[PDB]
Amino acid sequence: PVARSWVCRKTYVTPRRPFEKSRLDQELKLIGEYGLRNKREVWRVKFTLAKIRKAARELLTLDEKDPRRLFEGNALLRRLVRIGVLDEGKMKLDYILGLKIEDFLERRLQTQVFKLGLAKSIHHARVLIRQRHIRVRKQVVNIPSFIVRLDSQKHIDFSLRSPYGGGRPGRVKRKNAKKGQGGAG
Amino acid sequence: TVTIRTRKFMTNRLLQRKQMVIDVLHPGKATVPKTEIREKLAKMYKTTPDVIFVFGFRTHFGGGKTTGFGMIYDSLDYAKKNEPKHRLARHGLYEKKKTSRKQRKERKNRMKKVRGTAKANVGA
Amino acid sequence: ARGPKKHLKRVAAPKHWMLDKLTGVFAPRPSTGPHKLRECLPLIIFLRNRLKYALTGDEVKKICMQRFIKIDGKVRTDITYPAGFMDVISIDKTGENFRLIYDTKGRFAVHRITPEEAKYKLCKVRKIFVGTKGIPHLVTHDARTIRYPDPLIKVNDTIQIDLETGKITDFIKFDTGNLCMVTGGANLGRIGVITNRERHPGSFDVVHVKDANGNSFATRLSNIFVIGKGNKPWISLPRGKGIRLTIAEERDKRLAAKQSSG
RNA sequence: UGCUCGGCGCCGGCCCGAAGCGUUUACUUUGAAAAAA
RNA sequence: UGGUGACUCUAGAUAACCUCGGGCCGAUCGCACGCCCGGCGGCGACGACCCAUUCGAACGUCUGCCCUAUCAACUUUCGAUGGUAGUCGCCGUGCCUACCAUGGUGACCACGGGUGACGGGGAAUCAGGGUUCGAUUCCGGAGAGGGAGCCUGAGAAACGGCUACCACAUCCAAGGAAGGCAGCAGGCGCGCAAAUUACCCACUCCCGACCCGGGGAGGUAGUGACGAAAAAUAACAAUACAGGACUCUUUCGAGGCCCUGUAAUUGGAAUGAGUCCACUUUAAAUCCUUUAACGAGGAUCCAUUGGAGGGCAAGUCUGGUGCCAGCAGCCGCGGUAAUUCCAGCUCCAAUAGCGUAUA
RNA sequence: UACCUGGUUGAUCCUGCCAGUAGCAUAUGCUUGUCUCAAAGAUUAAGCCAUGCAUGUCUAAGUACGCACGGCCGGUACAGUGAAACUGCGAAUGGCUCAUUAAAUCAGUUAUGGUUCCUUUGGUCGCUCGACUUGGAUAACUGUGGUAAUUCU
């Protein structure tokens, strides 16, 4: 009898047909497009999409003017428009079934850093996010699997401890300057 | 250099102290030790560096803001009255014995092995 | 199991205590007292959670032993004393008083009261007892035995007593039309008006309670605690008035508060 | 669905309310009571 | 008098009893100390026959459990079914006695046997419908080698209490003493199978005459690839050249910004493991966060596991033995032209993880 | 995601099973940089255990003549802290295991009008018609012995 938690779940899912052409090439296309390490991340996004789709199907299996269906559907639409997957005009329960995985991956942190113009390439954006250079809402983030909300999208700048957007110069510049000063005299 | 702003502050006259939450804002520096926080909060509150007990300072990710808890008493006797002993030992106002619990347990078993006046001298 | 239990686990506690999961394996088992274990509130939980006057279990005991705690007008020095429903808590150091009554949902809520209101306590009689020499008795819900009551007091007629002596001051009859409180159950903490009552022989009687907004519900007879003479109550109701407003209106009010705040 | 007591109105009285009773079953629908994780 | 849906309920009245192994009817202790004229007073602590209340416990009512006919009749006055009157039990009743009648259950599965059976709240799988598991932190039940019997106590058939049995076993001058880790660490045995003879009452509670003492209940750290979540091993610029997205010399050629990809050509920008000062956390540290001084160009600071005929993504590559050695979950490859064996190159799959075997 | 593919024939349609494909929880094998949680002698043996620990407890309010410390004007005993011991309370809680048990345990719903209950809370405690404090025993202590040993006497 200890004070523990013992609660966990698997976030990704393994596909039924591992050995094929079409969606394997599609997942390679997604990895090479949006800059992902492996297929566990894209399987994680597919599992989240499957959970959202299952919740939407179990909402549509009920009837109109049901308080439970209306409450959970309004909460789901409000969360999905807070994330930024949907549009303000298309705030209905039937628009959930007509979205794809790249709608989720446009709100990823690396994609937003690359499309904000402050990064060179997608892999450069990923390795720059992982190396603690970019803050949001004056809080320095480290992780690239960051779902950027709609209200926290215009507050993505360089960190104040970074050698790019204002700060101390880095390790190799000071080392090169000290080496040049030692060699010159 | 170091900016302190208070929140969630309340005074309980039943425990004759003032408990509060201290946040430390140090931009781009190492975390401030508890002593400097003690005279900063003391000179903010116009109280001598004697009756302030702070604990549990955790630094957020990024090194820009820390959170902590602290209590300000009214007198040193009341600070010695209702306070845990380890913070008094941290301030050097209290000292505990250094004997381990295994020696105490074996001493208790040796004293329970005997009976009478022999408990004082046979059990160490 | 060769005797009574002395330890209570953390998840075995009732939900209205509102304990957390990671801080320990054990929970404060209350001492035996006026109220039942499943429906009570220990002084330690109320003091260290509802007002946060203490932080540890030793500090609330240092609070409690110094005779700064008055429950039902008498000084209590126990940390596991069950402070149940409708009890009064008096703090003479800070000049603040609390009355333990339910919220709109099934949990206890804090309720600041004036000291002049903190002199009486509504109690519900459980049974009518005759003594050893033809003398009438009365047993309340907190087992406070009162000798020589009014002879118009029936089996389920709530009374108003006084704390410092223990005498009967007033009472409210149990009739259809009086404002009522419910203790125990799924729809716990609702304010309504008693309209009907079914009499089932050999079983539990069920009454019908009508809310002020036209809502109607039902509960057992033993979960009925009448507090008012008709429509006007005797005790000041807290915020929300025990109305049991629905989930969608709760969300609408919460977003109204959020956009009003900013 | 009807045959002893009294109501929101009125002059021995109309209506309503009600102590009492008014085929048992399954099925179906609303409520209660239903430990926590 | 009072109540229940209902008393042989509570109370009222009369005539007795009331156990010496005995129901109560205060010979107990602190604090502040007092007014009236030796008596008279406040706040408590302890004990107490009684009632109600609180944690409960106990025996009952209705419904619900895996397999089996190579278990179709079972139990009976050494109680099986019911009746009368008693004993015991805290009461209710064959729970047990003395006397009575032969009753009770069963094909809608009794009875008998097995279980690799603690039961449930639950877990995995999952269109729908279902299958399997549940020793395992919560609830309830049973036991402390296994049967048996008890003292004390309100509550025990108690075993970190006692007595006797058998099985094993410690010390011994041999006359006698002392035994119970299916508690926390640890050893042997067993097995494919499972960790430290560590620290502390600070956090959560528990017990006591109780702010103050104790707690292997618990909390902390170590072992830890059972399993789960996140995620390093590189980015960019110029020279390496095949020409398109736009216009064009019948055709090379060329205007060519973004070029797109690639070779140990070069170049400055960079942070992380690790070494470590300090701060912080904590009963005191370590873990994490913060911050100085170090710290990457074969960034050796060197990423593995199985496969390359079909299912089943990926070579008629080369050399060797050539139905031998072997591969192969299934078809089948092995015969001196092996897309399957044994080595080197390239390539595909998940990638700090991958393959194999039993449920 | 309400999913199938190879194999009997000279070749073609079927029943059919074999083998692949995915999760799960036990062991084993190869390999290994950061960090947050976290299972762990359960399957065979409810087999045997050397060792150390796991249950003890005082306020103003039950007993204080241990100089073990210790206050003074000492004569209305007892200033105060006080080991030890008598007394009352808990040790029937917590912790471990799944060996018995197939209407047995347990689950939901009911009843004790057929009983008990430590402690807490509330009531009762001059309701009886008949000393301004009674008695002797034992601890602890002092002294003195047997045993090879015990929380033995």
Side-chain angles (χ1 to χ4, degrees), chain A residues 60-184:
Chain A
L60 273 296
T61 199
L62 292 181
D63 61 331
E64 172 56 80
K65 309 303 274 166
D66 193 316
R68 208 263 305 278
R69 154 167 165 162
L70 193 143
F71 177 61
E72 301 216 0
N74 189 29
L76 200 55
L77 272 295
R78 260 298 315 275
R79 187 195 331 153
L80 274 181
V81 74
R82 181 173 74 147
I83 294 302
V85 185
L86 276 78
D87 189 358
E88 291 92 7
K90 311 181 184 305
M91 201 97 79
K92 290 205 299 173
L93 204 54
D94 62 358
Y95 285 102
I96 298 178
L97 295 164
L99 61 84
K100 314 273 181 223
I101 180 166
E102 71 76 21
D103 305 354
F104 286 163
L105 274 74
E106 293 293 328
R107 304 311 297 185
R108 207 186 163 94
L109 186 50
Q110 324 173 22
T111 287
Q112 266 281 345
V113 169
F114 178 73
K115 284 163 168 47
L116 265 179
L118 60 85
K120 275 179 263 179
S121 69
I122 294 95
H123 327 284
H124 173 246
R126 159 140 183 152
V127 68
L128 192 62
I129 283 293
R130 197 39 183 163
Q131 185 177 182
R132 309 180 52 182
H133 288 75
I134 295 91
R135 62 182 175 102
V136 297
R137 57 188 161 74
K138 86 192 74 174
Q139 156 72 39
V140 171
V141 298
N142 189 359
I143 193 66
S145 55
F146 191 90
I147 300 296
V148 168
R149 303 182 186 181
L150 197 66
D151 62 358
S152 68
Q153 194 253 346
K154 284 172 55 192
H155 292 67
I156 310 186
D157 291 331
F158 296 94
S159 52
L160 300 184
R161 204 178 181 270
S162 70
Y164 301 148
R168 206 186 66 163
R171 195 187 83 196
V172 72
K173 189 172 183 62
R174 300 184 289 105
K175 181 73 173 304
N176 260 336
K178 282 183 70 71
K179 177 185 176 184
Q181 280 278 349

Side-chain angles (χ1 to χ4, degrees), chain C residues 187-200:
Chain C
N187 49 7
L188 162 57
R190 299 192 67 166
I191 281 291
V193 185
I194 297 169
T195 46
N196 290 318
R197 168 191 180 181
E198 291 88 298
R199 203 158 282 102
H200 303 282

Side-chain angles (χ1 to χ4, degrees), chain C residues 128-198:
Chain C
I128 289 294
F129 192 33
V130 55
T132 186
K133 279 192 176 180
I135 51 177
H137 290 263
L138 190 153
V139 178
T140 67
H141 74 279
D142 52 352
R144 201 188 313 274
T145 312
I146 312 297
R147 282 214 309 181
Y148 295 137
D150 200 66
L152 312 169
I153 298 314
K154 299 314 285 168
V155 189
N156 166 8
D157 279 333
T158 61
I159 58 175
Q160 166 175 343
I161 72 171
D162 72 278
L163 304 167
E164 73 294 330
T165 61
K167 289 288 184 55
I168 311 298
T169 315
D170 213 322
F171 71 102
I172 301 176
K173 286 291 299 179
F174 175 62
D175 287 320
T176 76
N178 300 301
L179 190 140
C180 183
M181 211 65 158
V182 56
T183 187
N187 49 7
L188 162 57
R190 299 192 67 166
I191 281 291
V193 185
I194 297 169
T195 46
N196 290 318
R197 168 191 180 181
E198 291 88 298

